């Protein structure tokens with residue numbers, strides 16, 4: 157048919173300099189000229205970059221089986237001993253079977269009803285517990301220091317939820333086992349983010365690379381923690397009393413695809429679990445602090461729809477259209493997952509009249525959709541009201557153009573869990589407390605590129621109870 161178009165690139169390094177430190181911004185300007193299917197080169201490796209709401213739906217959904225593979229990148233082979241469900245090049249029926257195990261394991265210990273509490277489910281019970289511990293920890297910080305860095309304590313509250321779902325345990329707010337793994341050891345996004353030169357320039361792996369060495373250690377540390385957590389569950393495993401997702405995977409090793417590819421699925425769940433949800437909640441607090449106008453509106457809605465006599469529940473999610481418009485605009489404006497995990501073609505295929513051979517690396521630019529000047533009014537501006545119709549309800553036609561959970565056969569499997577976890581944490585907190593940042597302190601809202609885009613650490617947040 158045709159080869160996908162693209163700008164001129166150096167014969168040796170390709171367009172690696174055009175990408176720069178923000179490949180999502182460069183490839184969004186590039187799509188304005190070369191279209192929804194364009195081709196670049198990182199070093200000598202060709203890469204196809206998909207942009208556009210309809211073209212990405214055409215490729216990942218309607219032709220999903222043509223794009224459901226992962227490329228064979230170097231950085232991916234360092235994840236979970238090279239056998240990760242999400243990052244391994246395996247995309248046949250072996251992957252499809254592991255994905256179905258994860259989906260069923262999640263539904264059982266997140267959305268399913270809790271035997272302990274008749275009213276709520278597992279997720280609502282865990283989030284309610286951790287949101288109270290979080291509010292108490294922040295009250296203690298206002299008793300002394302008078303300020304705090306939220307990420308340090310949100311990451312614990314969010315980890316205790318996904319950790320209770322995967323290992324049936326929780327940890328205190330000041331635990332060295334936990335913070336070592338999750339905090340200040342998470343350059344996973346920085347190393348795995350699409351366009352990493354080390355994947356396409358083979359010499360950068362062997363040179364002095366401080367980030368790549370800390371990455372090998374982070375994974376080796378996590379894989380050891382998994383072995384400790386699974387061996388301890390195997391030592392007390394009772395068939396019939398399934399405590400968490402780990403037990404249902406142990407149960408599935410005895411009921412019949414190696415045992416390692418079954419057990420290390422919790423590493424993908426635990427990993428994606430705390431990294432994305434913590435990033436999302438962290439960004440939310442930044443926007444509430446920089447836009448006190450919209451924090452006041454979220455609270456005026458909570459006071460009308462729920463009052464202050466009872467904690468918000470999952471049932472209230474559909475009766476709070478402004479809270480959902482805020483969370484949607486946090487996902488759209490930040491786009492803290494600017495690219496999906498890189499895809500790969502499983503066969504010679506055709507897309508919008510362009511030929512893509514088998515094995516071609518494929519990037520999916522979610523950031524471009526969420527800031528397309530043709531789909532949005534003031535994309536650079538943070539304006540939650542853009543999702544509200546004239547009668548104050550969520551515009552469903554427009555809200556389903558916020559692409560951040562992926563699409564197709566490789567779509568996020570914890571999407572529904574993240575939307576409820578994010579809603580509850582924000583709803584329970586903003587009902588009780590009000591966050592702020594004093595004047596005259598810098599608050600760098602600039603995203604830092606990575607698989608999940610984080611922000612500069614802010615240590616000046618404050619919190620007060622409400623009347």
Ligand code: HEM
Pocket residue numbers: 241242243255258318424425426428429432433436493495496497498560561562563565566567568569570571573574
């Ligand atoms: C706001 C929160 C989250 C966002 C924005 C998000 C986004 C994404 C994206 C963009 C992908 C890749 C899509 C693709 O490759 O086409 C993905 C995959 C995945 N997500 Fe999520 N995610 C979130 C939360 C979660 C949670 C809470 C879990 C589990 C507890 C989870 C588990 C996974 C897994 C296992 C994959 C790999 C799927 C595969 O490789 O087929 N994610 N997510």
Ligand SMILES: C[C@H](CCC(=O)NCCC[N+](C)(C)CCCS(=O)(=O)[O-])[C@H]1CC[C@H]2[C@@H]3[C@H](O)C[C@@H]4C[C@H](O)CC[C@]4(C)[C@H]3C[C@H](O)[C@]12C
Pocket residue numbers: 390391392393394395
């Ligand atoms: C640490 C090992 C665990 C080895 C084990 O038991 N491995 C079973 C796993 C095999 N499966 C997964 C197939 C079982 C599935 C069961 S299913 O129901 O699924 O069929 C278990 C097995 C024997 C246990 C000791 C004795 O008790 C004596 C004593 C009991 C008291 O309390 C105080 C503790 C003490 C010292 C115990 C310590 C420890 O606790 C031991 C060494």
Ligand SMILES: O=C(c1cc2cc(F)ccc2[nH]1)N1C[C@@H](CCl)c2c1ccc1occc21
Pocket residue numbers: 235236240242342344374375376378379423424425426427428431432493607608
């Ligand atoms: O799978 C993921 C993941 C993050 C993420 C973010 C997204 F926005 C969308 C999809 C995603 N997936 N992670 C992250 C990391 C824990 Cl920080 C980690 C794994 C997996 C196996 C691992 O072994 C040792 C560490 C480790």
